[PDB]
């Protein structure tokens, strides 16, 4: 598709809306790299590689009483207009309550993770 990352993000923003147990999404090293921070931060239970012939990423979403584990989640860096932030440009999503995934040379990390490493990159999306 146009922007696979945005698709995945949306396909998850959708699954949570309908309170779905798990959601499929075409596999991809980059995608997996992302799903890695979502599970560590606590946005998702985890994930697993599924698919008889086609590689998929069965994502197991979790919920709680009141609000969903992931209220908001959207991509800020699209193919139409890429964005890059410096070590001091990394914005703290919701005073830190939430985090943002960035793609740097050191690898895919969050605001705090990237802030510690001391590097900046393309702001994948905010959650």
């Amino acid at each position: 598709m146009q922007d696979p990352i945005a698709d995945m993000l949306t396909r998850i923003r959708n699954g949570q809306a309908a309170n779905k147990a798990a959601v499929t999404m075409p596999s991809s090293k980059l995608k997996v790299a992302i799903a890695n921070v979502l599970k560590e931060e606590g946005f998702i239970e985890d994930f697993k590689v599924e698919g008889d012939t086609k590689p998929e990423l069965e994502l197991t979403l979790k919920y709680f009483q009141g609000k969903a584990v992931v209220e908001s989640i959207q991509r800020v860096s699209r193919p139409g207009l890429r964005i890059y932030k410096r070590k001091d440009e990394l914005p703290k999503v919701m005073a830190g309550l939430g985090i943002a995934v960035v793609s740097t040379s050191k690898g895919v990390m969050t605001d705090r993770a990237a802030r510690q490493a001391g590097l900046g990159g393309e702001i994948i999306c905010y959650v």
Partner: protein
């Protein structure tokens, strides 16, 4: 104890059948200064009658702003009617930089430092609401962690 602040008072006049009946309105802000706020807007024939009645209503409808080091948690943009209000936390030594309608509500709120601005409609009655509404949508890490 609780502290009050008079935002503004309007004469207000309507053409009632038989002449002109005057009714004064008044915006009051009740707050202790450690995390609670209260907005009141009652009417009355006399100015003081409205002021008192307002303070009573302000104390009846209070909110609990989760202050953090004399500031707020995360930025918020409330949009009441045509009016609009934005808020953004700031380090110490900043000072409540905002409108009198918002500042008065922030000062009593306990907020020591904060950056804000009014967009769209700037009605003093619509801005105060948008202000107290944004103070409600405010959340802390414990809330976002517990609710999750």
């Amino acid at each position: 104890e609780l502290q009050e602040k008079l935002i503004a008072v309007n004469r207000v006049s309507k053409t009632v059948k038989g002449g002109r009946i005057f009714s004064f309105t008044a915006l009051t802000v009740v707050g202790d200064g450690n995390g609670r706020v209260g907005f009141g807007y009652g009417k009355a024939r006399e100015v003081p009658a409205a002021i008192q009645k307002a303070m009573e209503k302000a104390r009846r409808n209070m909110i609990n702003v989760a202050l953090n080091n004399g500031t707020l948690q995360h930025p918020v943009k409330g949009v009441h009617t045509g009016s609009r209000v934005f808020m953004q936390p700031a380090s110490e030594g900043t000072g409540i930089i905002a409108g009198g309608a918002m500042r008065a509500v922030l000062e009593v709120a306990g907020v020591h430092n904060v950056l804000a601005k009014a967009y769209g409609s700037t009605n003093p009655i619509n801005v105060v609401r948008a202000t107290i509404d944004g103070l409600e949508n405010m959340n802390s890490p414990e809330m976002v962690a517990a609710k999750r």
